[PDB]
Design a protein around this ligand. Structure first.
Ligand code: FMN
Ligand code: FMN
Lengths: 376, 376
C-alpha cells in the first residue's frame, strides 16, 4: 500500500501518507480551544502521522463561523498547548492552519459589528450562505476594501499568529490561502477588482500571498510553513478566468521564496474541485476527471517540494495519487470526521463510518465530534 | 401507505403512485424496438400502474446512446405496438418519452456526419463523456447552433413522432425537456447564448419548449401529453442563473397552453436536483437542501395539474412526498431496474434487490435486463 510507505517531509519522518485535512468544526466555544478539541485530535493522531488543525483566527476580524479557535491571544495559546501535547504524546506531527475569512463574514462575527474586510467592496452573492450563531443561514454583506497600510497590518497578524503557534508547540503552520477566503480574494480575478499594486496582473494579484508567506517564513523559518491554495475551486464566488495560469503563478512565487530563503516550505497543499457522479442521470457516471487531474499534476510538477492533494479522496484515489507520483501526501476531510481511526481503516481496507453533515458545525463537545466509533 | 392511495390522472384511474421512470437501457438493437423490451416492461407493469418508456428517437439525428429505440419510422411503430399490447394486457398505462439529445451526440450517431444540433456552438465540456457503441467512452464534439428557421423542423419531428406513438397505441407521450438535452439546451442560460428570438429573456429561452409542447398538443390533445423538465440539475453542463424563475416561466407557459387548449396536460414531471456540489468546502452546502425543497414546492404549487417527482427517491422519501402534498406521483429509476416487482415490494416493504450499473446500457436481452428476480 503506497499510502503506507514512509515519507520524509523536511525533518519529519512520517510513517504514512494519510493526512488530517484542516476542518472547521465550531467546538472552540467563544474562540477558545476547548478540552473537546484535545480529545478529537488525540483520537485521530497516529505515530508518524501528520495532522492539520481547523482554520484558526489570526485576529478579531478574521472569523466567519461561530466558535472557531483563535491563536492571537495568550489565553488561546495556553489552551492550544494542551491539545498539541496530547497529539505529540501519540507521536503525531501537527500544524496550525491560520485562517482569515475576509469578506466571508457577517457583522455578528466582527468587533462592534464592523463590515468584514477584503480586497474589494463586492459582496459574495446570494448563491452562498453564512452559518449564523443560532444555526440559521445568513446573507454575506458588503465588505470594506483595505488599503496598503492595513494590508501590512493583516500580514503582521499572520506573523504574530505564526509566532504564537510555535509558542504553543505546533510543528508548523499552514496558510489558508484557498476556498475564496481573504488571500483568495486577492488571488482570484473574479473578486480582485483593485487598480493599485495589489490588483490587475498576475504578479499584482500574487503580491498579498507572497507577502503573507514571506512574513511568516522570516519569523519561524520556511521549514515550519505550509501553504494551501485552490486555484480551480470557485467556492464563495471565487472564480479566475484562467485557473491553471493563476495556480502556476502562485507556484512560481513559492519556488522563488524558497530560492531566496535558501530553504523549502514544508509543503504546498492544493484542494481540487471534485464533481460528484450523479447516479440518477443518463450520463452522470460516464464522466471523466482527466482535465482536473492534469491541472493538479501540472501544479505538482511545477512546485519544488512536497505536494499534498485534497478534495474528494478515497482509499482507492489516495493510493493511485501516491502510486502515480501525483502527490506525496493525501489529506482527508469528511471521512476523517466520521472515522477517528481512518489511518488504520485505510491500512486494513476496513469499512468506513458514514459522516453526518448535520453535526459538522454544531457546538456539542461529544455528539457528532468524538462519538464516532473505532474499529471493533 | 400514501403510495397506494389511488390517483386520478386525467381519464387514467391509477391504483398506486409508483411510476416507472423513463430509462435508457440500449436493448433496442439498431434503434428498432425488440421483444426483450416487451418482456422488460411487461415484468414491471401492474394493474393501474403508470409506465414511461426509455427516451425514444424523434429523427435519425436525435440519438446520443447506442441501440435506443426510435418512433420515426413505420417499422418502429409496428414493433412498439407489440410492446404496448403486452403492457396493456396487464392493465397498465404507458407513455412514450420523445427524446432528442441535441449537442449530446457524436459522429457515430450522426448518419450524415453533420455536427449535432443545439441552441449554441459551445461543446459539452471535457468532464462529460458519451457512451460509444463498443462500450468505451467518447468525447462530445462541437455542435452547430441551429438557425431560427430550423427550429420549426425539429418541432415538426416531435409532432410526427407523437402521432406515431399514438398510432402504436401509446396512452400518451412525454416530452424529454430535461437533463441538458436539446430542449434544455434552449432553456438554460448557461447553455443558450443566442441573441435571436430564442435567446436572452426567460420568455425567449422558453419559446422552444412551448412550441414543441403546443405542436404535440395540437396533434394528439393535451390529455395525452406529459412534460419532463429539470430546472436545477448538474448534467452535461446545463446550469441556469435562476432555476426558480426558469422553472416558473416554464410552468406558466404550460398553464397557459392548458387554458387556451381547454384541457390539462397529462402531467408535469420534474427531476429532483439532489444537489451535492461543494461537499468538500466549508460553506458550499449551507442552505442548499432548503433551496432545493423550496424550488420543488414552488413549482408544484404553481403548476395547475398532476406533478410527478423523480430522482433519488426511496420507499421512505416517496411516502413522505405524497404525504406532505409535494407530488401526486413518484417515479423510480434504478430500483425499478433491479426490482421488476418494485411496486409489490414497496407495498409489502420487502427487501429490494441491488442494481448492477455495469449492465445498465449493455445489449444483452436478458443479463441485467430481465433476469433480476421477483419475490419468491
Ligand atoms: C466540515 C468541513 C470543514 C472544513 N474546514 C476547512 C478549514 O477550516 N480550512 C480549510 O482549508 N479547508 C476546510 N475544509 C476543506 C477540507 O480541508 C478538505 O479540503 C476537504 O474536506 C477534503 O475533501 P474530502 O472531505 O472529500 O476529504 C473543510 C471541509 C469540511 C467538510
Ligand atoms: C440507467 C438510467 C437511464 C435513464 N434514462 C433516462 C431517459 O432516457 N430519459 C429521462 O428523462 N431520464 C432517464 N433517466 C433518469 C430517470 O428517469 C430517473 O429520473 C432517475 O433514475 C430517478 O432517480 P432514481 O434512480 O434514484 O430512482 C435514467 C436514469 C438511469 C439510471
Amino acid at each position: 500500500n503506497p499510502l503506507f510507505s514512509p515519507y520524509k517531509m523536511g525533518k519529519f519522518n512520517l510513517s504514512h501518507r494519510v493526512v488530517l485535512a484542516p476542518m472547521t468544526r465550531c467546538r472552540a466555544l467563544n474562540n477558545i480551544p476547548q478540552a473537546a478539541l484535545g480529545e478529537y485530535y488525540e483520537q485521530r493522531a497516529t505515530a508518524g502521522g501528520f495532522l492539520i488543525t481547523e482554520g484558526t483566527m489570526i485576529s478579531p476580524t478574521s472569523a466567519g463561523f461561530p466558535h472557531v479557535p483563535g491563536i492571537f491571544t495568550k489565553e488561546q495559546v495556553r489552551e492550544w498547548k494542551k491539545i498539541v501535547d496530547v497529539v505529540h504524546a501519540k507521536g503525531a506531527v501537527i500544524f496550525c492552519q491560520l485562517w482569515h475569512v475576509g469578506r466571508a463574514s457577517h457583522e455578528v462575527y466582527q468587533p462592534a459589528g464592523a463590515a468584514p474586510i477584503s480586497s474589494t467592496e463586492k459582496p459574495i452573492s446570494n448563491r452562498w450562505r453564512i452559518l449564523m450563531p443560532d444555526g440559521t443561514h445568513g446573507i454575506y454583506p458588503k465588505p470594506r476594501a483595505i488599503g496598503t497600510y492595513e494590508i501590512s497590518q493583516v500580514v503582521e497578524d499572520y506573523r504574530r499568529s505564526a509566532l504564537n503557534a510555535i509558542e504553543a508547540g505546533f510543528d508548523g503552520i499552514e496558510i489558508h490561502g484557498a476556498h475564496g477566503y481573504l488571500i483568495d480574494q486577492f488571488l482570484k480575478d473574479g473578486i480582485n477588482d483593485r487598480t493599485d499594486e495589489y490588483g490587475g496582473s498576475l504578479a499584482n494579484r500574487c503580491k498579498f500571498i507572497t507577502q503573507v508567506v514571506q512574513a511568516v517564513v522570516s519569523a519561524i523559518g520556511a521549514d515550519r510553513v505550509g501553504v494551501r491554495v485552490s486555484p480551480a475551486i470557485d467556492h464563495l464566488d471565487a472564480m479566475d478566468s484562467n485557473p491553471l495560469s493563476l495556480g502556476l503563478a502562485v507556484v512560481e512565487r513559492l519556488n522563488k521564496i524558497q530560492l531566496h530563503s535558501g530553504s523549502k516550505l514544508a509543503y504546498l497543499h492544493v484542494t481540487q474541485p471534485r464533481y460528484v457522479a450523479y447516479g440518477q442521470t443518463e450520463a452522470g457516471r460516464l464522466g471523466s476527471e482527466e482535465e482536473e487531474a492534469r491541472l493538479m499534476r501540472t501544479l505538482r510538477n511545477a512546485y519544488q517540494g512536497t505536494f499534498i492533494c485534497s478534495g474528494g479522496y478515497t482509499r482507492e484515489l489516495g493510493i493511485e495519487a501516491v502510486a502515480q507520483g501525483d502527490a506525496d501526501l493525501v489529506s482527508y476531510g469528511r471521512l476523517f470526521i466520521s472515522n477517528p481511526d481512518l489511518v488504520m481503516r485505510i491500512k486494513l481496507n476496513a469499512p468506513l463510518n458514514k459522516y453526518n453533515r448535520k453535526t459538522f458545525y454544531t457546538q456539542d463537545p461529544v455528539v457528532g465530534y468524538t462519538d464516532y466509533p473505532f474499529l471493533q
